[PDB]
């Protein structure tokens with residue numbers, strides 16, 4: 521679990537969105553595994569606006585933050601689980617690191633701010649949903 525709180529927005533994995541998120545919806549995209557809802561209070565996270573490929577992510581299944589090198593956002597064919605079908609996920613970055621399904625929502629950050637959130641992984645892979653292109657998160 522986990523979210524980004526920037527301005528009056530809450531950014532979560534689309535597959536973990538609550539009824540309150542859907543009832544206060546700003547934007548959602550299934551191909552990216554992202555959903556954004558509106559908040560009453562202002563958040564403290566800042567979004568990175570950069571092309572960093574090194575940063576640190578939070579892993580809830582280890583209570584630890586790990587430094588990682590990650591790929592540029594791309595369209596990767598994903599994993600067919602017994603929970604979910606196999607499909608193309610867009611704007612996805614991969615790194616070598618531990619993850620479990622419940623780690624989704626953990627933040628990946630660089631020197632500039634928040635880069636994205638945990639969304640895919642396995643066999644020592646963790647994939648993150650990028651948010652650096654969503655410029656509108658910084659206003660309105």
Ligand SMILES: Cn1cnc(CCNC(=O)c2nn(C)c3ccccc23)c1
Nearest residue numbers: 535553604619620621624639640641642
């Ligand atoms: C519809 N839908 C779109 N996206 C999803 C979530 C897909 N994520 C996973 O299945 C998953 N996520 N992490 C970090 C893992 C680590 C090990 C094994 C599996 C996973 C569902």
Ligand SMILES: [Zn+2]
Nearest residue numbers: 570572630632
């Ligand atoms: Zn950066």
